[PDB]
């Protein structure tokens, strides 16, 4: 648990921040549920938007079999 | 007749059958064997044992290329997933890596549910 975005007081999860985003996807590239990471509901949504937004720019992968 | 020493095994494990194709790293097939063509029909064909025999025959089919290391790419939900990888090791190949390449739509409408 212990959402790390309330803890760090983030205002937007900032898809360009690939260092953070890689902590919230699995080895195969799927978004990890807020139930597992204990992210708040509000930030989990912004996290999913940032991850999909980074996947489009090829900063992150969609799958592991590209 | 050529010597490669470095091939890729493609296990195609469906609910009804298992197909093992050993290709080189470039994706050109060297040989293949199936559970159905290994003397198994119907109920037998879709067992883990039928896939093991299929794996051994495919290893026996590519013996003239002298493959030494073998990547294993497993596809499908079939009962012949795990037992086919063991049989490749039992033959005497070196499994360098094992991957699941089962295609997942992120797609088309699937067929209707069977009312059995």
């Amino acid at each position: 648990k212990f959402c790390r975005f309330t803890a760090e007081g983030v205002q937007e999860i900032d898809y360009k921040d690939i260092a953070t985003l890689k902590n919230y996807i699995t080895e195969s590239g799927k978004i990890v549920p807020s139930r597992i990471t204990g992210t708040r509901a509000k930030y989990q949504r912004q996290l999913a938007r940032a991850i999909k937004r980074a996947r489009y720019l090829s900063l992150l992968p969609y799958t592991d079999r590209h | 007749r050529k010597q490669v020493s470095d091939g890729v095994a493609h296990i195609h494990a469906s609910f009804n059958n298992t197909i093992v194709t050993i290709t080189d790293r470039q994706g050109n097939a060297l040989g293949w064997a199936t559970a159905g063509g290994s003397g198994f029909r119907g109920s037998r064909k879709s067992t883990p044992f039928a896939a093991q025999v299929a794996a051994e025959r495919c290893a026996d089919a590519v013996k003239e290329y002298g493959i030494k290391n073998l990547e294993v790419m497993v596809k499908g939900p079939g009962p012949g997933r795990e037992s086919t990888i063991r049989a490749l090791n039992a033959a005497g190949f070196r499994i360098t890596n094992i991957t699941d390449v089962t295609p997942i739509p992120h797609g088309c409408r699937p067929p209707k549910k069977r009312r059995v």
Partner: protein, 70 residues
């Protein structure tokens, strides 16, 4: 679920590491879930039924802790 076999690693445990990685990815369930079409009416009837049954077992467990069998 890409497992690269490591040095001095026995085969079986790498085969154990592979079985783990595919289950954590839930690919086998994902394939079985996509083989027949599921109506939106039924996916919702199931989701709901899952939640209400997930809920009921929690309260049943909370309650059974305040009980004696003998």
């Amino acid at each position: 679920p890409v497992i690269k076999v490591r040095e001095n690693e026995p085969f079986d445990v790498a085969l154990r590491r592979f079985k783990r990685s595919c289950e954590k990815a839930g690919v086998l369930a994902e394939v079985r879930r996509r083989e027949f079409y599921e109506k939106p009416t039924t996916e919702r009837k199931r989701a709901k039924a899952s939640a209400v049954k997930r809920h009921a077992k929690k309260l049943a467990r909370e309650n059974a802790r305040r009980t004696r069998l003998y």
